[PDB]
Amino acid sequence: DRQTAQAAGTDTTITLNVLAWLYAAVINGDRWFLNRFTTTLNDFNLVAMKYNYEPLTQDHVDILGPLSAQTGIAVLDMCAALKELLQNGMNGRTILGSTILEDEFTPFDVVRQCSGVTFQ
Questions:
Q1: Structural contact between residues 19 and 64, judged by C-beta atoms closer than 8 angstroms
Q2: Tally of domains within the chain
Q3: What CATH number does residue 48 fall under?
Q4: What are the respective helix, strand and coil percentages of the chain, to the nearest 5?
Q5: Which residues contact residue 15 at a Cβ distance below 8 angstroms, ignoring those fewer than 6 apart?
Q6: Residue 105 DSSP code
Q7: Exposure string over 11-20, b if 16+ CB within 10 A, otherwise e
Q8: Is the CB of residue 54 less than 8 Å from the CB of residue 17?
Q9: How many angstroms separate the CA atoms of 32 and 90, rounded?
Q10: What is the extent of the structural domain holding 29?
Q11: 3-state secondary structure of 40
């Protein structure tokens, strides 16, 4: 049988967890995609929905707050960096010991003392 095909596998991607994963990538080192252009939450949400990514809200932005403190990258610049990745890709590169990116990773993990000597 083929219950919830695409609708529960490819129609959406957990944007908050991708932003969390990209903060972990910045923390590990990789930040070539990390522009400083900023973005509105509305235009970010529109680009997310254009490319099968969920919209984001202030309650979800707050979860990324301590990751912005640990890296100096404001959440709207992490949003703007993902907004660039959604339009340009990364398949010819590596970012976290892989050629692709993730949304499976649980959020709020990188609030720890991951300052450079260790990460997990």
A1: yes
A2: 1
A3: 1.10.1840.10
A4: 45, 0, 55
A5: 48, 53, 54, 55, 56, 60, 82, 103
A6: S
A7: ebbbbbbbbb
A8: no
A9: 10
A10: 1-120
A11: coil
Which residue do the tokens 């912005």 mark? 68
Question: Sign of torsion, CA 55 56 57 60?
Answer: positive
Give the long-range contacts of residues 102-107, CB within 8 A, separation 24 or more: 102/17, 102/18, 102/21, 103/13, 103/14, 103/15, 103/17, 103/18, 103/21, 104/17, 105/17, 105/20, 105/21, 105/24, 106/17, 106/20, 107/16, 107/17, 107/20, 107/63, 107/64
What is the end-to-end Cα distance of the chain in Å, rounded? 40
Count how many Cα atoms sit within 13 Å of the Cα of residue 45 in the half-sphere of its side chain: 9
Cα–Cα distance measured from residue 2 to residue 72, given in angstroms and rounded to the nearest whole number: 45
Tokens found for residue 71 = 């890296």
